Amino acid sequence: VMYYGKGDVFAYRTYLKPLTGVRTIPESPFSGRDHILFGVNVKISVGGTKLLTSFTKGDNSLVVATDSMKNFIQKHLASYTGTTIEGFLEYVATSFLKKYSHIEKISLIGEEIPFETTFAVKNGNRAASELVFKKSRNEYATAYLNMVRNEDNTLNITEQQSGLAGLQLIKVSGNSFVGFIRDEYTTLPEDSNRPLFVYLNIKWKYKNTEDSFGTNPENYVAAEQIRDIATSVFHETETLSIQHLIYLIGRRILERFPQLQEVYFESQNHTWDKIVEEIPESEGKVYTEPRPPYGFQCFTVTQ
Amino acid sequence: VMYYGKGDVFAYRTYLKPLTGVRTIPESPFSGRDHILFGVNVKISVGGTKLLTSFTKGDNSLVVATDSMKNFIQKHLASYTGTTIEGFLEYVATSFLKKYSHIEKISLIGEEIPFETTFAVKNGNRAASELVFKKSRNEYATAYLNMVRNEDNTLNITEQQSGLAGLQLIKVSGNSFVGFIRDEYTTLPEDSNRPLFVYLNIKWKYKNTEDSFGTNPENYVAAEQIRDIATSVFHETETLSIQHLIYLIGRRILERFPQLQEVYFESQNHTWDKIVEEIPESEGKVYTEPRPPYGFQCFTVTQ
Amino acid sequence: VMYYGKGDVFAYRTYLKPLTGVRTIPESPFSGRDHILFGVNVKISVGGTKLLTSFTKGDNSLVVATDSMKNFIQKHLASYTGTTIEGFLEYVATSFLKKYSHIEKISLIGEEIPFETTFAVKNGNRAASELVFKKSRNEYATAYLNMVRNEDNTLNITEQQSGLAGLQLIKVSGNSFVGFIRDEYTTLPEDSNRPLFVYLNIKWKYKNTEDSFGTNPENYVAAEQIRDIATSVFHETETLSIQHLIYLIGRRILERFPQLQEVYFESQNHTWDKIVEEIPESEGKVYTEPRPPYGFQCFTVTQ
Amino acid sequence: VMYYGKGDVFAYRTYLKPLTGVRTIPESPFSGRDHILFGVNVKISVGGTKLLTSFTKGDNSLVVATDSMKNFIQKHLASYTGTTIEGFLEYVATSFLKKYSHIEKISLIGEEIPFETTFAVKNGNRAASELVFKKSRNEYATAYLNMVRNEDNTLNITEQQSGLAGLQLIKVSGNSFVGFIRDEYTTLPEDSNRPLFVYLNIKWKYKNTEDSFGTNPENYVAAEQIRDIATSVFHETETLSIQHLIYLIGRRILERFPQLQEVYFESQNHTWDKIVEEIPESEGKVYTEPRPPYGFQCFTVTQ
Ligand SMILES: O=c1[nH]c(=O)c2nn[nH]c2[nH]1
Ligand SMILES: O=c1[nH]c(=O)c2nn[nH]c2[nH]1
Ligand SMILES: O=c1[nH]c(=O)c2nn[nH]c2[nH]1
Ligand SMILES: O=c1[nH]c(=O)c2nn[nH]c2[nH]1
């Protein structure tokens, strides 16, 4: 392995071209993105055989400074005329490989830095502000893109995936976990009604990479829509395990978005421990945080 | 000083009595809390001269185990019949001092663990779910309550305050910071139009402690309403500094809630550094994260 | 309340004047600091009645920018000719009040950024490096100073406190917790031999604030020495509780350092849960992390 | 992809069999580990075609609960008679596959939870304590193991890797970064003498997997020795870049440990910004923390 690059390249752009013209699904009211405020955290990695002597000899002649990569990303966010993080990464990657012919490969990660609408009273009524935004530390969209310069000096995308990270959902009832192996290592009781609390990271892969860029936005798959499918399916399903739930979310994703090839789940179990099971004259219960160990599930659903 | 207790006592209750009958303000559509899911993180501290020998002699005869304090809090969340974190703390404090007559003082902090509504498609339409909630890592309500046993064995509340923590608001334009001292220590440029990014922690103190408990809910001041005042005032104001902004927020809070005695602000400046000031054929700009040092301001507004 | 300032002012100085001539104690090998690398994280808070209109009117005429306070601190670390964080805070505070006559109060917190020695080999010989240091995320020294301008324009230190933060100590045996109250809320079993794991924050005040500066190093109390007292007392003591332990550490500190007036403890209990109590042909056991709730103790010992 | 498992399985063992007889090297006096306290954080991932219906149908018949995997790991730490994390992982993997015939693949990560010796006094004689240890949040050893069940039912280790994570080293002088590309994106000044601050994660692979277990300690490569090579090479080298440094560290490791096949580096650049470059009558300078973006390098050196 031989790579180097820059991480935590934060870049905030105001008034990016809005995303509109998206194709709706029943689970989601998502209709586009205003892009008054557009934030991204970019990681860039680059490689190529011509970088060998920067390691073996300390010769920096062909080294693009990682600081310069940061400048490159921030300048290109200013000049970017598209509407998606996915398209931004393609713009950076193509531009970078064109600038630096001795670089053979570039890998990019982009994480949305999300902001939420706020409201203000002016001129007699309360309405969504065009100026004030709330920074959100909850779920955020992601994008991945790698590009290579082939031996004949043409450029090709070699990896492209989009995702949703940091989704934390708890369903207070309508979940069971029963029937698992009960042997000398088992102390978990069967539970026919648990408050299942899952963390979800979901990544999808398009059949056609162009669909991820937003150039024809009807073919784009928005993280907001994926989020709304996850919450709807969770609600609809009498879950039998996290494994069972994520398969059903993946099936719904692929049914709603036939232009997707596959979807990959990383889930974690953070379900609370029960403290009080019965409250006089009430349907309520009391729970608390568990010990640190957490379950996880990794599963790919394919079209 | 001589205190001991328990921190990070997480407790989650389902179907707490709903909060309704609140009094509305123009800045906020807040109308109550469903309380299907109610989460709190409690810190408890206790003191009293009769605890001295637990330190000086290792005599535990009068020590309530901190583990037992955790049990006490969790069991009392199950039996609490009220509607606010503030009222829950009063319930815990009164019950604890009544149980342990050798304790002279108890101090409680309660932090909301907030959850957000999600939506699902069922029976033909998309609607808010009564089952699935999204855990939020953004702003959260807080409550503080201390109680003492007086020499005559009566009980009195000695401190009570409510608050809103973790509010992070950025206003993309309509903010200046000019006219400050420019001397041999100054390298900050004057800025007539900055994207002010503030973190806000807001704490309010009622004239009458009973108004914080929700027993007469029309007198309650909800953190949600405070949040909406902050975003509205930020939007409305051509800010001249963070100092200027928080004074105006405080004035609006005290105008909207005449039952409050005072409001206290802790603010932090996290405004981004500018990278690209002019983008062709666009009003947008590009910013990035600053170095770690952050400004802060602390100010009390009184009725 | 009315203050503002700057937090997370990191400043790293190479080749500060070495701290020499400190009085050693039997518990610690500490004899000074080479100060090849000296790191501090400073927080500065300033107040004064003349700051009022910066809040109430948006008037910035008397506003020292918080950015300028950062410059002030970093420049004064370059010009500081002393040998301790405590003395550095005094230098900054005096300098700041002499510079800005409208400031009536300044509060400073200084936290050591600790580095540990590393070893290197030169012509076969292994010895401590004078060039390479390891950044430590473990315990660190602290200092606090509050200075006021009196009506007659003299400057007075009204509060001074030094400390050690982030010390995490586990004693595998020789600890008990028995004899505490057992009632309807008590599930904690009595334990005659637990692996007590405590977090310690230890703060001390001098009888004479001048002794904190290091000008007469024989009177200076080093956080390193406090660390080694704490571990030695923990080792020696068959502890009966954390309360019992911290009182005994405090007594030993005050015996070793008669120039101190008080020692204040903030401790937390993070003792592991036992999983396997008996291992064949072994004295060992297996433990794991507990649930999040943690006990804490707060206690002052006075000279 | 189809796996599931358990993360953050903390397990602490007292009086593990000591590691002794480790061959020393010039750069390190390390010869073994007393193992009075042995802490590990384990992540376990398992797979197998027979797990399919646990996802596709919600059938839990062949689901080992992740909670039971936690119990399995903690119980096996109690019964483990070896001396290394690498060997512990082999013990867990082999035992798990022997127990659960439907599992075809197991992947394990083990991270040391490191503790440091402390001082205690006995009759004025200061010595290392056999009871009190300091929990360290600095660098720590790692181990990785993947084991598969073949069609002929033999068990085979397909990947094994050891490592050191979290090493943070700063060298105050004797580092340059010059001669890199200067074009339209370059603003970084050349620096002939910078205080290079690197984060290092170092991983190695053995020619023979059996050498990683420690059964013959003379063939075992300890993370502590790798740590000491890294600090020594950093000191000795007039570095020309991080790339240059990590190649030289890798070469030294492979020279000292001919039983290793490769060393893999993940480094990060966290070098401070210079604030004051000249201090009168002093060689010192003042630096501060940079903006968030960080450089990184990834590189494999082979035997
Ligand atoms: O949904 C679940 N899947 C699992 O594999 C599991 N193991 N313990 N609890 C669990 N819950
Ligand atoms: O609003 C602000 N107040 C301040 O005091 C300040 N100092 N630097 N920037 C600032 N912005
Ligand atoms: O040392 C202790 N002090 C306490 O107060 C306590 N409570 N539970 N466990 C405890 N341990
Ligand atoms: O050691 C370094 N390598 C790099 O690639 C680099 N880029 N900017 N600074 C740097 N320092």
Can you tell me the distance from the alpha carbon of A81 to that of A75, in angstroms, rounded to the nearest whole number? Answer: 12
CATH number at residue D149: 3.10.270.10
What whole-number distance in Å separates Cα of residue C137 and Cα of residue C166? 9
Please give the single-letter amino acid code of residue D108: L
Other Cβ atoms within 10 Å of B126 Cβ, number = 15
Q: Chain B residue with minimal CA distance to C72?
A: B185
The pair phi, psi for residue B184, each rounded to 5°, is -70, -5
Who's near A16: CB < 8 A, 6+ residues apart? Answer: A35, A38, A80, A83, B284
H runs (alpha helix) in chain B = 52-56, 66-79, 85-99, 223-236, 242-256
Nearest-10 crossing angle of helices A242-256, A223-236: 130
Annotated binding residue D67: yes
Contact D58, A241 (CB under 8 A): yes
Residue D134: Cβ within 10 Å count: 18
Please name which of C239, C49, D2 lies closest in space to residue A247, comparing C-alpha atoms: D2
Token pair belonging to D221: 């490569």
Nearest chain B residue to D290, by CA:
B291
Three-state DSSP at D113 gives coil
From chain A residues 24-53, the ones with a CB under 8 A of any chain B CB are: 26-27, 29, 36-37
Q: A223: closest CA among A288, A301, A167?
A: A167
Q: Is D197 in the pocket of ligand 4 (CB under 6 A)?
A: no
For residues A85 and A82, give the distance between their C-alpha atoms in angstroms, rounded to a whole number.
9
CA dihedral over D244, D247, D252, D255, signed as positive or negative: negative
Q: How close C94 comes to chain A (CA, Å)?
A: 38
Start-to-end Cα distance in chain C: 33
Residue A156, helix vs strand vs coil: strand
The conformation of residue A93, written as its DSSP 8-state character, comes to H
Considering only CA atoms, which residue is closest to atom 4 of ligand 2? C65
Give the three-class secondary structure for B173. Answer: coil
The helix (run of H) or strand (run of E) holding residue D182 is none
Query: Among D178, D216, D214, which residue's Cα sits nearest to residue D196?
Result: D178
Dist CA B170 CA B33 (whole Å)? 27
**Vertex A294 angle, CA A291 and A296, to 5°:** 170
Q: Rounded to an integer, what distance in angstroms lies between the CA atom of residue B25 and that of residue C286?
A: 57
Nearest CA to ligand 4 atom 11: D241
Q: Answer yes or no: is B275 a known binding residue.
A: no
**Other Cβ atoms within 10 Å of B138 Cβ, number:** 16
Distance of alpha carbon B202 from alpha carbon B163, whole angstroms: 5
Q: Cβ of A216: how many Cβ atoms within 10 Å? A: 10
Residue D6 among the catalytic residues: yes
Neighbour count for residue C266 (Cβ, 10 Å) = 18
- Cβ neighbors of A43 (< 8 A, separation 6 or more) are A5, A6, A7, A8, A9, A108, A109, A110
Q: Specify the number of domains making up chain C.
A: 1
CB distance D219 to D259 below 8 Å: yes
Experimental method: X-ray
State yes or no: A109 annotated in a binding site: no
Q: Are A270 and A293 in contact (CB under 8 A)?
A: no
* Helical axes A66-79 vs A85-99, angle rounded to 10°: 130
Out of B43, B50, B53, B66, which one is annotated catalytic?
B66
**Residue C244, Cβ neighbours under 10 Å: how many?**
23
Which phi and psi angles does C54 have, rounded to 5°? -65, -30
What does chain B come to in residues? 303
C126, exposed or middle or buried, with CB in 10 Å at 0-12, 13-18, 19+? middle
Spell out the residues 6+ positions from residue D240 whose beta carbon is closer than 8 angstroms to its own: A58, A60, D176, D177, D178
Separation of alpha carbons D73 and D64, rounded Å? 13
Q: Give CA–CA dist D76/D89, Å, rounded.
A: 10
Say if CB C62 and CB C75 are below 8 A apart.
Answer: no
Residue C242 CB–ligand 3 contact under 6 Å: yes
How many C-beta atoms surround the C-beta of residue C218 within 10 A? 10
Q: What is the nearest CA distance from C51 to chain D, expressed in angstroms?
A: 29
**CA–CA separation, D110 and A225 (whole Å):** 37
Task: Tell me which residue of D185, A140, A98, A153 sits closest to A90, measured CA to CA.
Answer: A98
CB-based contact A260:A252 (threshold 8 Å):
no
Give the Cα separation of D172 and C117 in Å (integer): 13
**Helix, strand, coil percent content, chain B, rounded in steps of 5:** 25, 40, 35
Distance CA A261, CA A264 (A): 10
> Within an 8 Å CB–CB cutoff, is residue C165 touching chain B?
no
Which 3-state string (H, E, C) describes chain C?
A: CEEEEEEEEEEEEECCCCECCCCCECCECCCCECCCEEEEEEEEEEECHHHHHHHHCCCCCCCCCHHHHHHHHHHHHHHCCCCCHHHHHHHHHHHHHHHCCCCCEEEEEEEEECEEEEEEEECCEEEEEEEEEEECCCCEEEEEEEEEECCCCCEEEEEEEEEEEEEEEEECCCECECCCCCCCCCCCCCECCCCCEEEEEEEEEECCHHHHCCCCHHHCCCHHHHHHHHHHHHHHCCECCHHHHHHHHHHHHHHHCCCEEEEEEEEEECCCEEEECCECCECCCEEECCCCCEEEEEEEEEC
Cα–Cα distance, B176 to C73 (Å, whole number): 25
The DSSP bridge partners found for residue A287 are: A274, B12
Q: Which atom of ligand 3 is nearest to the CA of B66?
A: 7
Is residue D19 within 8 Å of D32, Cβ to Cβ? Answer: yes
Are the C-beta atoms of A6 and A41 separated by less than 8 Å?
A: no
* Helix pair angle (B66-79, B85-99), 10° resolution: 130
SS (H, E, C) B106-171: EEEEEEEECEEEEEEEECCEEEEEEEEEEECCCCEEEEEEEEEECCCCCEEEEEEEEEEEEEEEEE
Nearest CA owner, ligand 1 atom 1: A241
Please spell the DSSP secondary structure of D55-70, one letter per residue: HHT---TT---HHHHH
SS3 A193: coil
- Residue of A29, A231, A279 lying closest to B118 (CB–CB): A231
- At D222, which amino acid appears? A
Q: Are C134 and D168 in contact (CB under 8 A)?
A: yes
Among candidate residues D250, D274, D251, D243, the one with its CA nearest the CA of residue D179:
D243
Write out the residue range of the structural domain in which residue B291 sits. Answer: 1-303
Pairing status of strand A105-112 against strand A140-149: antiparallel
The helix or strand, by DSSP H or E, that contains position A234, with its residue range, turns out to be helix A223-236
How far off is chain B from A251, nearest CA to CA, in Å? 16
Longest dimension (CA), chain D: 77
Residue D179: phi and psi, rounded to 5, are 85, 5
What residues of chain D lie within 8 A of the CB of A5, using their CB?
A: 295-296
Query: Does the CB of B285 have a partner CB in chain A at under 8 Å?
Result: yes
DSSP for D232-258, written as a single string: HHHHH--BS-HHHHHHHHHHHHHHH-T
Could you tell me what percentage of chain A is helix, strand and coil, using 3-state DSSP and rounding each to the nearest 5? 25, 40, 35
Distance from C-alpha of A41 to C-alpha of A73, rounded to nearest angstrom = 10
- What residues are paired with C42 via a beta bridge? C9, C110
Largest CA distance in chain C: 77
Rg (chain B; Cα; Å): 23
Q: Taking CB atoms and an 8 Å limit, are A231 and B132 in contact across chains?
A: yes
Tokens of B228: 């909406």
Residue B295, both tokens: 């400004």
Q: Where are the alpha helices (DSSP H) in D29-175?
A: 52-56, 66-79, 85-99
Strand C125-135 and strand C140-149: the pairing is unpaired
> Is residue C269 lining ligand 3, measured as CB closer than 6 Å?
yes
Chain C residue with Cα closest to D8: C289
Reported in sequence order, the residue ranges of chain D that DSSP labels E, i.e. its strands, are 2-14, 37-47, 105-112, 115-122, 125-135, 140-149, 155-171, 197-206, 260-269, 273-276, 286-288, 294-302
Question: Which B residues in the span 166-185 are in contact with C, Cβ-Cβ below 8 Å?
Answer: 177-181, 183, 185
CB-CB under 8 Å, D171 with C37: no
